[PDB]
Design a protein around this ligand. Structure first.
Ligand SMILES: Cc1ccccc1-n1c(-c2cc(C(=O)N(C)Cc3cccs3)c(O)cc2O)n[nH]c1=O
Ligand SMILES: Cc1ccccc1-n1c(-c2cc(C(=O)N(C)Cc3cccs3)c(O)cc2O)n[nH]c1=O
Lengths: 208, 208
C-alpha cells in the first residue's frame, strides 16, 4: 500500500529553507517544472531513435498546464520518459545531495533562490507556491506510481490505482491559500512568455 | 579506417551561420563545452548509483582545460559517460535538427547567438573560435573513437588507435589564428569565473 520515506537531511533542510525564507519572486517555480518536463521529453525522444517501440505508450510530445480553481491546483502534465519506482526514490535522492549542498553554500555567498535550477534541484521551488505536491508518473519499464509530499521531512510512494496516463509525469501543485494568482490565465501566460518562451515542445495552457 | 559523413542540411546551415556571422562575444563557446561536460558527468554519476561497476573505467569526476600555445589548441577534457560510435553519428544527429530550426527561427526574431545552448546545439559555438574540432571519446559499452570536423558540411569518424582515456570525452579546439587569447591563463580564468562558476565538478585550468 502506502510507503513513507524520510528525505535525506540536506533535502529536508533545502525544503525548509524554501518554505520559510522571505522571497517574493515565487513565479520561478513554473520555469523549473517546465524545464524538467522538457528534459524528460528530450530523454524519450532520444531513446525513440534507436528503439521506436518506446513511443507505443504515446506519440505526442507536449506539456499541458491545467489550472483548477475549485481544487486550488495547478497541474503540469508532460508525456516525457516518466519515472520508475526506483527513480521516484533513488533519484532526489543521492544526485540531489551534491546540488543541495552547493546551492545552500551559494545562498550564503550572496546568491538568489532564482538560481536553484543551476544546481539540479529546481523542482523544490514548487514549495514556494505549493503546500503539497502530488506527482503521478508512468515509465515504459514500470507501473504507474504516485509520489506525494507536504514537505515536513517525509514523502510517500504508492502504486497508482487511478486513471492510466500511458507515459509521462503529472505534477499536481496543491497551492497555498495566498498563491491563487498561479490559477489565473493572464498570470500563467505572462510567466510562460517571460521564462519558458524557447522550450522545444508545445505548451498548452488549459482554460476553465 | 576513416568514415566521412555529411552533416544534416540544417546543421551544415547552422555551422555556416556560426562561422560567417559577425559576432564579437566569442567567449560563450567555453560555457557551452563545460556545460556539456557537466551533463555527461551527471549521466555517469546517475548510472553509477544502481550499477557501481560503471566507475571501474575511472572514479574521478572532473573537467580539465588544457591550453597548448605550440599546437594552438584548447582542450576540454571530462571523465563523463562518454559516447558510443552510435552517439557520435546518430546524436547531433536527429535531436539537433529540431533545436537548430528553432534557434535559427529565434535569431530572425531578434535573438542573440549567446542563447544557442537553450536549443541543445551549444557545442556548435566551438566554431566561433575553432577552425577544426577533434573529439576523442570513450564510453563503457564501446571502443575509443575520434570524431573530427573543419565544418564545410562533413565530419569524419574513425577508431582511435591513440592513447586510451578510460572513460569520457576530450574536445580539442584547433583555434583560428586571431583567437589565441583563449590560450591565455588570465583569459580562461576570467571566462570560467564569469560563466561557469556554479558547475558541480572541479574545473582544473592547466598552465604551460
Ligand atoms: C527525474 C528527472 C530529473 C530532471 C528532469 C527530468 C526528470 N524526469 C521526469 C520529471 C521529473 C520532474 C521532477 O523533477 N519531479 C516530478 C520531482 C520529483 C519528485 C520525486 C522524484 S523526482 C518533473 O517535474 C517532470 C518530469 O517529467 N520524468 N522522467 C525524468 O527523467
Ligand atoms: C552527447 C551529449 C550531448 C549533450 C551533453 C553531453 C553529451 N555527452 C558527452 C559530451 C558531448 C559533448 C559534445 O557536445 N560534443 C563533443 C559534440 C559532438 C560531436 C559529435 C557528436 S556530439 C561535449 O563537449 C562533452 C561531452 O562530455 N559525452 N557523453 C554524452 O552524453
Amino acid at each position: 500500500e502506502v510507503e513513507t520515506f524520510a528525505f535525506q537531511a540536506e533535502i529536508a533542510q533545502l525544503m525548509s529553507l524554501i518554505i520559510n525564507t522571505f522571497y517574493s519572486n515565487k513565479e520561478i517555480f513554473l520555469r523549473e517544472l517546465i524545464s524538467n518536463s522538457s528534459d524528460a521529453l528530450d530523454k524519450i525522444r532520444y531513446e525513440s531513435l534507436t528503439d521506436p517501440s518506446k513511443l507505443d505508450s504515446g506519440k505526442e510530445l507536449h506539456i499541458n498546464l491545467i489550472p483548477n480553481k475549485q481544487d486550488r491546483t495547478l497541474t503540469i502534465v508532460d508525456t516525457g520518459i516518466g519515472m520508475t519506482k526506483a527513480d521516484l526514490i533513488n533519484n532526489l535522492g543521492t544526485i540531489a545531495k551534491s546540488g543541495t549542498k552547493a546551492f545552500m553554500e551559494a545562498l550564503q555567498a550572496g546568491a538568489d533562490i532564482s538560481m536553484i535550477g543551476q544546481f539540479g534541484v529546481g523542482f523544490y521551488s514548487a514549495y514556494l507556491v505549493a503546500e503539497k505536491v502530488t506527482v503521478i508518473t508512468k515509465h515504459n519499464d514500470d507501473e504507474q506510481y504516485a509520489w506525494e509530499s507536504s514537505a515536513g521531512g517525509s514523502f510517500t510512494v504508492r502504486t497508482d490505482t487511478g486513471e492510466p496516463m500511458g507515459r509521462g509525469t503529472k505534477v499536481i501543485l496543491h497551492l497555498k491559500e495566498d498563491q491563487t494568482e498561479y490559477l489565473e490565465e493572464r498570470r500563467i501566460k505572462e510567466i510562460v512568455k517571460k521564462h519558458s518562451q524557447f522550450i522545444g515542445y508545445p505548451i498548452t495552457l488549459f482554460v476553465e
